[PDB]
Amino acid sequence: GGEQATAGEWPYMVALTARNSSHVFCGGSYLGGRYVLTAAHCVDKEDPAKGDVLLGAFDMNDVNTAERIHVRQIYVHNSYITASMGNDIAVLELERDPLPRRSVQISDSSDFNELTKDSPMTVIGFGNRPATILHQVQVPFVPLPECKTKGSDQDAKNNYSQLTNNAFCAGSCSGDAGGPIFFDSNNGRKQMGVVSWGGRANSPGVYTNLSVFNDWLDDQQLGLSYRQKRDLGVVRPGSYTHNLTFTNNGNADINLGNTFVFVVGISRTDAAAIVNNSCTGVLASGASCDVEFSYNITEHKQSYVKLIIGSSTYKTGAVHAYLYFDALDAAPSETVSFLANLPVHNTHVNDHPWTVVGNGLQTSALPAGEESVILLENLPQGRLKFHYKLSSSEVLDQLFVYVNDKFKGKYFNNTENLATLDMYGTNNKVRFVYRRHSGSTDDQSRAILSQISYDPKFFD
């Protein structure tokens, strides 16, 4: 019961696209001014200039009728880790003012409480994550305690059972990820949620609970403009500086108090400090300031330099900023030679490196509680094939494989077999992480990869 929508019914629909391209990757909504609301999982750590917005998206074969605007910055909730854990919310600051256009009204707690079991709600979208023309479909509200019991296998049941009140559920296509869900509150139409995760039976949609983010949402729209998340990718351990510019694109003063900067982790040798800060006090409409910091990365890990600046003007009390990094050393020549039959851009390793032993790449001797890491950075789409062999008396000594930061395989101690990973996607990263567990008592715990190949086709 998905009906095509009529132009004009939802002028605040937004579609997200790669810059100047006409292919929708996520949905969204217009909050007014220069701001669009979407899901964090749609945009987290992306370069904003890579993206466009189509306001009033309707027909994707006539995108002239929508207004294309470049994105200037992305703001993601400071608690967001993944869609299942919640806080799946983000705001995009557009480069310029849109043509006058109606904006969505955001739900507040009192509106949310009107919701009861089977209250109909409306979802709109093109069905991304399909339809060239916008559809709308009605769905029933499902209370969190019931939603939490959904699923028939570990993966879903675990995802559903871990839900919190930063999210809510409605009974199940049509919406895009990041897209809006509405309820007619008698106080009028309100956007209640954002499509976050989840024709399967008993698998309701999960949506970000916007009634619990009104303060964060208002803060983001005050107009402070800066690059909140920058991913540096792979970095060598060493000493660096970085500069961040803040601009007030709002109409009112924004007060900025004290400042913290630090590398996230437990290392005592990692460090960060302010080297220059012109943003203290009161930043004024149209004005800019800068924060420069030094940072020292010594532990090989995937972390981020965090900056926090307090603000009395902000209801949530502070401004967050991030510089993500994956600290690893370059694979030496022997290893690059070993992998030369792959079309890989770059190979990297941690401090307990995989190195060539005989016909195989093998984990370095590693202490309990540590891991041996190798990263294959920038492979084209296709399949990676390999043989693996793990040997440890400890059952929690295991090999974990990620493709583009998504977990894709686990391999158990004392087992050997051929495996294949599909790398969909234009540009791919494959990370091998052998974890010797905290309690592992086998000092010989190891893994070996051999027969490693790239196949550009996906069968046979």
Tab-separated table of C-alpha atoms in Angstrom:
chain	number	residue	atom	x	y	z
A	1	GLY	CA	0.000	0.000	0.000
A	2	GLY	CA	2.668	2.401	-1.240
A	3	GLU	CA	1.031	5.161	-3.281
A	4	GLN	CA	2.888	7.590	-5.455
A	5	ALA	CA	2.883	10.979	-3.824
A	6	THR	CA	1.586	14.147	-5.419
A	7	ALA	CA	3.943	17.049	-6.068
A	8	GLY	CA	3.413	19.685	-3.404
A	9	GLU	CA	2.253	17.315	-0.738
A	10	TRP	CA	5.713	17.082	0.792
A	11	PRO	CA	7.788	20.076	-0.262
A	12	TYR	CA	10.198	19.438	2.611
A	13	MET	CA	11.386	16.099	1.255
A	14	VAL	CA	15.100	16.039	0.647
A	15	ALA	CA	17.220	13.680	-1.341
A	16	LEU	CA	20.953	13.383	-0.810
A	17	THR	CA	23.267	12.826	-3.799
A	18	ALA	CA	26.904	12.787	-4.673
A	19	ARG	CA	27.888	16.155	-5.997
A	20	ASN	CA	26.338	17.122	-9.278
A	21	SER	CA	25.157	13.554	-9.745
A	22	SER	CA	21.499	12.585	-9.833
A	23	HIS	CA	21.575	9.333	-7.906
A	24	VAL	CA	20.061	9.338	-4.506
A	25	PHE	CA	21.902	7.645	-1.696
A	26	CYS	CA	19.892	8.787	1.271
A	27	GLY	CA	16.789	10.679	2.254
A	28	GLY	CA	16.336	13.712	4.460
A	29	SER	CA	14.149	16.695	5.433
A	30	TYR	CA	14.318	20.480	5.409
A	31	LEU	CA	14.489	22.142	8.773
A	32	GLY	CA	14.435	25.750	7.478
A	33	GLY	CA	17.232	28.175	6.670
A	34	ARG	CA	20.361	26.464	5.477
A	35	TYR	CA	19.678	23.178	7.305
A	36	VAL	CA	18.712	19.627	6.405
A	37	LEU	CA	18.108	16.754	8.801
A	38	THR	CA	19.165	13.201	8.033
A	39	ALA	CA	20.682	10.094	9.565
A	40	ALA	CA	24.255	10.079	10.791
A	41	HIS	CA	24.849	6.729	9.072
A	42	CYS	CA	24.229	8.463	5.785
A	43	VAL	CA	26.988	10.996	6.256
A	44	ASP	CA	29.348	10.085	9.117
A	45	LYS	CA	32.949	11.110	8.440
A	46	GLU	CA	32.259	12.042	4.843
A	47	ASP	CA	33.708	15.052	3.085
A	48	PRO	CA	30.822	17.479	2.810
A	49	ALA	CA	31.855	18.841	-0.535
A	50	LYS	CA	31.202	15.387	-1.983
A	51	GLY	CA	27.501	15.858	-1.452
A	52	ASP	CA	24.528	17.707	-2.672
A	53	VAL	CA	21.049	18.131	-1.494
A	54	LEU	CA	17.920	18.150	-3.660
A	55	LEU	CA	15.255	20.041	-1.766
A	56	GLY	CA	11.659	19.119	-2.701
A	57	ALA	CA	12.908	15.963	-4.335
A	58	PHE	CA	9.958	14.383	-6.152
A	59	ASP	CA	10.622	12.961	-9.603
A	60	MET	CA	14.242	11.843	-10.041
A	61	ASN	CA	13.808	12.031	-13.764
A	62	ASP	CA	13.015	15.689	-13.528
A	63	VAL	CA	15.403	16.987	-10.913
A	64	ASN	CA	15.138	20.470	-12.389
A	65	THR	CA	11.989	20.952	-10.415
A	66	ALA	CA	13.917	20.308	-7.200
A	67	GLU	CA	16.495	22.809	-5.952
A	68	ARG	CA	20.072	21.480	-5.947
A	69	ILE	CA	22.276	22.940	-3.251
A	70	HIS	CA	25.832	22.081	-2.262
A	71	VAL	CA	26.503	20.934	1.282
A	72	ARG	CA	29.018	23.000	3.250
A	73	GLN	CA	29.343	21.048	6.517
A	74	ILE	CA	28.045	17.943	8.186
A	75	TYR	CA	27.190	17.681	11.897
A	76	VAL	CA	26.718	14.274	13.541
A	77	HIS	CA	25.596	13.649	17.117
A	78	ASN	CA	28.597	13.294	19.385
A	79	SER	CA	27.279	9.978	20.805
A	80	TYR	CA	26.762	8.299	17.385
A	81	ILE	CA	28.775	5.110	16.785
A	82	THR	CA	26.470	2.982	14.526
A	83	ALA	CA	22.887	2.934	13.461
A	84	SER	CA	21.949	0.034	15.736
A	85	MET	CA	23.327	1.775	18.835
A	86	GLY	CA	21.095	4.812	18.152
A	87	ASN	CA	21.763	8.540	18.146
A	88	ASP	CA	21.445	8.161	14.390
A	89	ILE	CA	21.037	11.788	13.577
A	90	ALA	CA	22.751	14.459	11.601
A	91	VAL	CA	22.335	17.935	10.305
A	92	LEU	CA	23.707	19.330	7.026
A	93	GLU	CA	24.539	23.011	6.687
A	94	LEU	CA	24.039	24.103	3.157
A	95	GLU	CA	26.289	26.476	1.314
A	96	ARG	CA	23.559	29.107	0.830
A	97	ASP	CA	20.021	30.068	1.547
A	98	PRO	CA	17.393	28.126	-0.292
A	99	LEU	CA	14.466	29.669	-2.035
A	100	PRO	CA	11.678	30.225	0.395
A	101	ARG	CA	10.333	26.815	1.284
A	102	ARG	CA	8.242	25.291	3.917
A	103	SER	CA	10.061	23.433	6.616
A	104	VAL	CA	9.211	20.412	8.686
A	105	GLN	CA	7.936	20.811	12.293
A	106	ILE	CA	9.960	18.694	14.732
A	107	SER	CA	8.256	16.579	17.333
A	108	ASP	CA	8.593	17.283	21.038
A	109	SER	CA	7.999	15.004	23.964
A	110	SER	CA	4.362	15.868	24.290
A	111	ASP	CA	3.764	15.051	20.654
A	112	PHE	CA	5.632	11.756	21.040
A	113	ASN	CA	3.485	10.725	23.976
A	114	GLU	CA	0.419	10.980	21.810
A	115	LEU	CA	1.785	7.914	20.084
A	116	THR	CA	0.207	4.608	21.134
A	117	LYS	CA	0.088	1.173	19.709
A	118	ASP	CA	-0.991	1.213	16.072
A	119	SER	CA	-1.129	4.946	15.678
A	120	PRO	CA	-0.734	5.391	11.913
A	121	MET	CA	2.353	7.302	10.827
A	122	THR	CA	3.455	8.265	7.362
A	123	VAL	CA	6.720	7.373	5.651
A	124	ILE	CA	7.851	8.932	2.413
A	125	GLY	CA	10.692	8.122	0.053
A	126	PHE	CA	12.082	6.486	-3.035
A	127	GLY	CA	13.098	3.261	-1.273
A	128	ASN	CA	16.885	3.732	-1.121
A	129	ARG	CA	18.798	1.438	1.369
A	130	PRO	CA	14.166	1.715	-6.867
A	131	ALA	CA	11.522	4.463	-7.230
A	132	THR	CA	12.085	7.480	-9.442
A	133	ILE	CA	8.896	9.064	-8.076
A	134	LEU	CA	8.191	9.776	-4.436
A	135	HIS	CA	6.037	7.364	-2.537
A	136	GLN	CA	4.196	7.495	0.755
A	137	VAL	CA	2.984	4.597	2.810
A	138	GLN	CA	1.276	4.434	6.161
A	139	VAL	CA	2.663	2.404	9.151
A	140	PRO	CA	1.604	1.497	12.692
A	141	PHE	CA	3.460	2.579	15.814
A	142	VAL	CA	5.011	-0.199	17.856
A	143	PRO	CA	5.886	0.464	21.494
A	144	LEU	CA	9.508	-0.037	22.444
A	145	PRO	CA	8.933	-2.826	24.919
A	146	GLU	CA	7.177	-4.859	22.248
A	147	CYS	CA	9.768	-3.872	19.580
A	148	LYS	CA	12.527	-5.054	21.835
A	149	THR	CA	11.162	-8.633	21.513
A	150	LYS	CA	11.284	-8.731	17.769
A	151	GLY	CA	13.567	-10.998	15.720
A	152	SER	CA	13.969	-14.784	15.197
A	153	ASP	CA	17.820	-15.112	15.078
A	154	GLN	CA	20.699	-13.749	17.148
A	155	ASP	CA	21.643	-10.820	14.956
A	156	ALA	CA	18.229	-9.115	14.833
A	157	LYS	CA	17.140	-10.162	18.251
A	158	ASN	CA	20.321	-8.622	19.566
A	159	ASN	CA	19.780	-5.436	17.608
A	160	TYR	CA	16.139	-5.137	18.623
A	161	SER	CA	16.727	-6.166	22.211
A	162	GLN	CA	19.346	-3.430	22.683
A	163	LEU	CA	17.053	-0.538	21.590
A	164	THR	CA	16.604	2.563	23.766
A	165	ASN	CA	14.293	5.537	23.902
A	166	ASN	CA	16.519	7.500	21.613
A	167	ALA	CA	14.687	5.393	19.010
A	168	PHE	CA	11.237	4.016	18.236
A	169	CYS	CA	9.662	1.478	15.949
A	170	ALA	CA	6.929	1.200	13.324
A	171	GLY	CA	5.625	-1.924	11.624
A	172	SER	CA	6.973	-2.769	8.126
A	173	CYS	CA	9.690	-0.461	2.238
A	174	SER	CA	9.392	2.990	0.613
A	175	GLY	CA	11.503	5.167	2.954
A	176	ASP	CA	15.093	6.042	2.271
A	177	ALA	CA	17.707	5.856	4.991
A	178	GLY	CA	17.890	9.276	6.619
A	179	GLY	CA	14.378	9.947	5.359
A	180	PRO	CA	11.388	11.311	7.280
A	181	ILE	CA	8.494	9.679	9.131
A	182	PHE	CA	5.514	11.792	10.116
A	183	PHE	CA	2.598	11.767	12.512
A	184	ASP	CA	-0.554	13.971	12.469
A	185	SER	CA	-0.563	15.146	16.051
A	186	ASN	CA	-3.816	17.206	16.061
A	187	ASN	CA	-1.330	19.798	16.894
A	188	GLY	CA	-0.568	19.266	13.196
A	189	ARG	CA	1.865	17.270	11.105
A	190	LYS	CA	5.180	16.556	12.814
A	191	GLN	CA	8.223	14.644	11.742
A	192	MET	CA	8.691	12.104	14.507
A	193	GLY	CA	11.704	10.167	13.253
A	194	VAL	CA	14.472	9.517	10.782
A	195	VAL	CA	14.861	6.189	9.002
A	196	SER	CA	17.720	4.432	10.759
A	197	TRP	CA	17.732	0.630	10.305
A	198	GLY	CA	15.610	-2.515	9.865
A	199	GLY	CA	8.819	-7.333	3.389
A	200	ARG	CA	10.085	-9.579	6.144
A	201	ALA	CA	7.630	-10.695	8.737
A	202	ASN	CA	7.928	-9.215	12.211
A	203	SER	CA	10.756	-6.835	11.392
A	204	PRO	CA	9.639	-3.313	12.108
A	205	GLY	CA	11.472	-0.200	11.093
A	206	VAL	CA	13.552	1.610	13.607
A	207	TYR	CA	13.606	5.359	13.654
A	208	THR	CA	15.565	8.005	15.511
A	209	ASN	CA	13.344	9.560	18.227
A	210	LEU	CA	13.512	13.241	17.356
A	211	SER	CA	11.584	14.315	20.494
A	212	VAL	CA	14.681	13.587	22.567
A	213	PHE	CA	17.031	15.620	20.279
A	214	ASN	CA	15.265	19.033	20.208
A	215	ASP	CA	18.092	20.736	22.131
A	216	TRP	CA	20.878	19.286	19.968
A	217	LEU	CA	18.932	20.117	16.838
A	218	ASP	CA	18.404	23.731	17.870
A	219	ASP	CA	22.096	24.107	18.732
A	220	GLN	CA	23.194	22.898	15.308
A	221	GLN	CA	20.993	25.526	13.669
A	222	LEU	CA	22.500	28.433	15.595
A	223	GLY	CA	24.892	28.845	12.672
A	224	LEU	CA	28.288	27.922	14.053
A	225	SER	CA	30.081	26.577	11.013
A	226	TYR	CA	33.114	24.345	11.050
A	227	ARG	CA	34.354	21.007	9.839
A	228	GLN	CA	33.248	18.762	12.698
A	229	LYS	CA	34.637	15.466	11.438
A	230	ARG	CA	37.685	15.007	9.307
A	231	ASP	CA	38.984	11.517	8.547
A	232	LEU	CA	42.704	11.584	7.788
A	233	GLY	CA	42.713	7.885	6.830
A	234	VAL	CA	45.964	6.060	7.477
A	235	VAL	CA	48.553	8.103	9.285
A	236	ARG	CA	52.068	7.240	10.378
A	237	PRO	CA	52.877	7.570	14.045
A	238	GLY	CA	54.472	10.923	14.685
A	239	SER	CA	53.985	14.537	15.561
A	240	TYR	CA	51.572	16.874	13.713
A	241	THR	CA	49.539	20.068	13.849
A	242	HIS	CA	46.065	20.885	12.698
A	243	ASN	CA	44.008	24.007	12.381
A	244	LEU	CA	40.281	24.398	12.562
A	245	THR	CA	38.262	27.435	11.569
A	246	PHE	CA	34.978	28.367	13.165
A	247	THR	CA	32.584	30.788	11.545
A	248	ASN	CA	29.336	32.193	12.881
A	249	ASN	CA	26.831	32.072	10.016
A	250	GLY	CA	24.026	32.861	12.461
A	251	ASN	CA	22.402	36.167	13.356
A	252	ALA	CA	23.302	36.175	17.029
A	253	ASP	CA	26.398	36.034	19.197
A	254	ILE	CA	27.800	32.619	20.153
A	255	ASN	CA	29.756	32.417	23.394
A	256	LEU	CA	32.709	30.090	23.521
A	257	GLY	CA	34.302	29.151	26.840
A	258	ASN	CA	37.017	26.643	27.723
A	259	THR	CA	38.740	24.213	25.447
A	260	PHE	CA	39.937	20.550	25.695
A	261	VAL	CA	41.886	18.615	23.131
A	262	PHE	CA	43.129	15.098	23.478
A	263	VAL	CA	43.850	11.857	21.724
A	264	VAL	CA	41.299	9.174	22.584
A	265	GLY	CA	42.687	5.987	24.137
A	266	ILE	CA	44.717	4.738	27.096
A	267	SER	CA	48.217	5.574	25.944
A	268	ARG	CA	50.301	7.803	28.194
A	269	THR	CA	52.605	8.813	25.343
A	270	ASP	CA	49.902	10.042	22.870
A	271	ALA	CA	49.290	13.776	23.297
A	272	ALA	CA	47.573	16.911	22.080
A	273	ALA	CA	47.628	20.541	23.069
A	274	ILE	CA	46.380	23.918	21.977
A	275	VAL	CA	48.995	26.003	20.187
A	276	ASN	CA	46.769	28.846	19.292
A	277	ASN	CA	43.170	29.735	20.067
A	278	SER	CA	41.405	32.869	18.932
A	279	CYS	CA	37.859	31.644	19.657
A	280	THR	CA	37.659	32.396	23.362
A	281	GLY	CA	34.877	34.632	24.489
A	282	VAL	CA	32.100	35.727	22.184
A	283	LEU	CA	32.023	35.107	18.513
A	284	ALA	CA	29.864	37.369	16.489
A	285	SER	CA	27.625	37.075	13.456
A	286	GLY	CA	29.751	36.840	10.332
A	287	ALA	CA	32.960	36.588	12.332
A	288	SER	CA	35.570	33.833	12.376
A	289	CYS	CA	38.099	32.357	14.657
A	290	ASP	CA	40.631	29.578	14.696
A	291	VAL	CA	41.856	26.790	16.874
A	292	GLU	CA	45.260	25.252	16.186
A	293	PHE	CA	46.484	22.222	18.009
A	294	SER	CA	49.445	19.892	18.002
A	295	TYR	CA	49.014	16.172	18.303
A	296	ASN	CA	51.411	13.292	18.942
A	297	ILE	CA	50.417	9.796	17.855
A	298	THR	CA	52.456	6.975	19.244
A	299	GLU	CA	50.096	4.040	19.623
A	300	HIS	CA	49.153	2.225	16.442
A	301	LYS	CA	45.411	2.189	16.600
A	302	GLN	CA	42.270	3.486	14.975
A	303	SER	CA	41.257	6.472	17.083
A	304	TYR	CA	40.634	10.213	16.867
A	305	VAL	CA	41.896	13.498	18.224
A	306	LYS	CA	38.973	15.109	20.006
A	307	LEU	CA	38.379	18.804	20.563
A	308	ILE	CA	35.655	20.103	22.851
A	309	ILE	CA	34.707	23.741	23.272
A	310	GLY	CA	32.194	24.779	25.920
A	311	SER	CA	29.456	27.212	24.995
A	312	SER	CA	26.922	28.806	27.272
A	313	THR	CA	24.916	29.663	24.158
A	314	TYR	CA	24.491	25.944	23.404
A	315	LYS	CA	21.743	24.110	25.252
A	316	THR	CA	23.866	20.931	25.206
A	317	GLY	CA	26.710	23.021	26.594
A	318	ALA	CA	29.556	22.299	24.142
A	319	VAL	CA	30.828	22.105	20.583
A	320	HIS	CA	32.537	18.855	19.492
A	321	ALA	CA	35.191	18.320	16.817
A	322	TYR	CA	37.116	15.326	15.500
A	323	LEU	CA	40.181	14.275	13.597
A	324	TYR	CA	40.022	10.520	12.927
A	325	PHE	CA	43.108	8.481	12.103
A	326	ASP	CA	44.256	4.921	11.595
A	327	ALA	CA	47.847	4.799	12.783
A	328	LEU	CA	49.914	2.204	11.066
A	329	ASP	CA	53.318	1.711	9.539
A	330	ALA	CA	54.060	1.027	5.958
A	331	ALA	CA	54.496	-2.637	4.955
A	332	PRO	CA	58.160	-3.179	4.076
A	333	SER	CA	59.418	-4.258	0.644
A	334	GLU	CA	59.285	-7.991	1.283
A	335	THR	CA	55.646	-7.788	2.189
A	336	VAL	CA	54.733	-5.487	-0.709
A	337	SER	CA	56.489	-7.950	-3.052
A	338	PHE	CA	54.577	-10.876	-1.511
A	339	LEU	CA	51.304	-9.099	-2.305
A	340	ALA	CA	52.300	-7.889	-5.764
A	341	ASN	CA	49.805	-10.101	-7.588
A	342	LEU	CA	47.048	-7.953	-5.974
A	343	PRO	CA	46.053	-4.634	-7.490
A	344	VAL	CA	46.378	-2.966	-4.015
A	345	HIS	CA	47.122	0.740	-3.606
A	346	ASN	CA	48.851	0.444	-0.245
A	347	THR	CA	49.619	-2.163	2.379
A	348	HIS	CA	49.974	-1.235	6.088
A	349	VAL	CA	50.717	-2.979	9.383
A	350	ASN	CA	50.612	-2.346	13.118
A	351	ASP	CA	53.292	-2.964	15.746
A	352	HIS	CA	52.767	-6.749	15.783
A	353	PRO	CA	52.944	-6.954	11.997
A	354	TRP	CA	51.982	-9.713	9.656
A	355	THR	CA	55.282	-10.583	7.859
A	356	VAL	CA	56.369	-13.098	5.253
A	357	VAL	CA	57.323	-16.507	6.570
A	358	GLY	CA	57.812	-19.187	3.937
A	359	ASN	CA	54.872	-19.225	1.552
A	360	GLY	CA	52.616	-17.214	3.841
A	361	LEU	CA	51.996	-13.973	5.588
A	362	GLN	CA	52.216	-14.660	9.306
A	363	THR	CA	51.359	-12.861	12.501
A	364	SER	CA	54.201	-11.638	14.696
A	365	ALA	CA	54.593	-13.082	18.125
A	366	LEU	CA	52.163	-11.126	20.201
A	367	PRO	CA	51.316	-10.639	23.829
A	368	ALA	CA	47.947	-11.458	25.308
A	369	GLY	CA	45.516	-8.564	24.940
A	370	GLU	CA	47.129	-7.402	21.756
A	371	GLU	CA	46.388	-7.731	18.073
A	372	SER	CA	48.263	-8.278	14.822
A	373	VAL	CA	47.019	-6.060	12.054
A	374	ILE	CA	47.413	-5.801	8.299
A	375	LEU	CA	45.452	-3.452	6.060
A	376	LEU	CA	45.081	-3.643	2.335
A	377	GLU	CA	44.109	-0.132	1.312
A	378	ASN	CA	42.460	0.738	-2.024
A	379	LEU	CA	41.535	-2.461	-3.810
A	380	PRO	CA	39.049	-2.301	-6.671
A	381	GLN	CA	35.734	-4.097	-6.665
A	382	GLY	CA	35.854	-7.839	-6.923
A	383	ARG	CA	36.705	-10.743	-4.680
A	384	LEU	CA	39.657	-11.336	-2.506
A	385	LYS	CA	40.490	-14.977	-2.020
A	386	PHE	CA	42.793	-16.391	0.602
A	387	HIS	CA	43.741	-19.403	2.563
A	388	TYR	CA	43.903	-19.082	6.324
A	389	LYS	CA	45.388	-21.212	9.080
A	390	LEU	CA	45.095	-20.326	12.753
A	391	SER	CA	46.736	-22.207	15.595
A	392	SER	CA	46.052	-21.503	19.241
A	393	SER	CA	44.987	-23.541	22.234
A	394	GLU	CA	42.914	-20.532	23.239
A	395	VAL	CA	39.439	-20.443	21.744
A	396	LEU	CA	39.141	-16.684	21.947
A	397	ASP	CA	42.272	-16.247	19.853
A	398	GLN	CA	40.551	-15.417	16.570
A	399	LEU	CA	40.932	-13.742	13.176
A	400	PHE	CA	38.553	-10.959	12.286
A	401	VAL	CA	38.179	-9.494	8.806
A	402	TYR	CA	36.712	-6.154	7.817
A	403	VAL	CA	35.922	-4.693	4.437
A	404	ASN	CA	35.462	-0.957	4.456
A	405	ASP	CA	35.083	-1.068	8.271
A	406	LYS	CA	32.179	-3.537	8.161
A	407	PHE	CA	32.738	-6.858	9.901
A	408	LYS	CA	32.699	-9.685	7.304
A	409	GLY	CA	34.296	-12.816	8.791
A	410	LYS	CA	35.497	-14.503	11.975
A	411	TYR	CA	37.820	-17.510	11.917
A	412	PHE	CA	38.354	-19.810	14.837
A	413	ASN	CA	41.455	-21.151	16.473
A	414	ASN	CA	43.068	-24.333	15.075
A	415	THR	CA	41.238	-24.251	11.710
A	416	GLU	CA	42.325	-23.823	8.096
A	417	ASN	CA	40.271	-23.331	4.949
A	418	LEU	CA	39.890	-21.243	1.810
A	419	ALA	CA	37.622	-18.200	2.010
A	420	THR	CA	36.491	-15.420	-0.313
A	421	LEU	CA	35.405	-11.879	0.475
A	422	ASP	CA	33.245	-9.866	-1.902
A	423	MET	CA	34.309	-6.305	-2.174
A	424	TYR	CA	31.404	-4.363	-3.661
A	425	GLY	CA	32.207	-0.715	-3.949
A	426	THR	CA	34.491	1.308	-6.029
A	427	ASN	CA	37.336	1.537	-3.665
A	428	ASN	CA	37.930	-0.988	-0.937
A	429	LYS	CA	39.855	-1.586	2.221
A	430	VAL	CA	40.403	-4.961	3.711
A	431	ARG	CA	41.595	-5.244	7.276
A	432	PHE	CA	42.923	-8.420	8.837
A	433	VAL	CA	42.955	-8.367	12.633
A	434	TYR	CA	44.193	-11.358	14.553
A	435	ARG	CA	43.251	-10.888	18.184
A	436	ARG	CA	45.137	-12.697	20.913
A	437	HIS	CA	42.739	-12.492	23.777
A	438	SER	CA	43.349	-11.009	27.185
A	439	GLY	CA	43.311	-14.440	28.870
A	440	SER	CA	45.227	-16.320	26.212
A	441	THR	CA	47.995	-18.369	27.617
A	442	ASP	CA	49.388	-19.779	24.348
A	443	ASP	CA	52.459	-17.689	23.591
A	444	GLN	CA	52.575	-19.328	20.151
A	445	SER	CA	49.146	-18.035	19.170
A	446	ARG	CA	49.386	-17.208	15.474
A	447	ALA	CA	47.705	-16.922	12.069
A	448	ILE	CA	48.886	-17.402	8.499
A	449	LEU	CA	47.445	-16.201	5.251
A	450	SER	CA	48.447	-17.757	1.953
A	451	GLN	CA	47.130	-18.229	-1.611
A	452	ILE	CA	45.997	-14.653	-1.643
A	453	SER	CA	44.370	-13.458	-4.809
A	454	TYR	CA	42.225	-10.839	-6.386
A	455	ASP	CA	39.459	-11.912	-8.803
A	456	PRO	CA	37.650	-9.076	-10.637
A	457	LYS	CA	34.605	-11.239	-11.401
A	458	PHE	CA	32.289	-12.518	-8.642
A	459	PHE	CA	31.667	-16.221	-9.547
A	460	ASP	CA	33.421	-19.362	-10.681
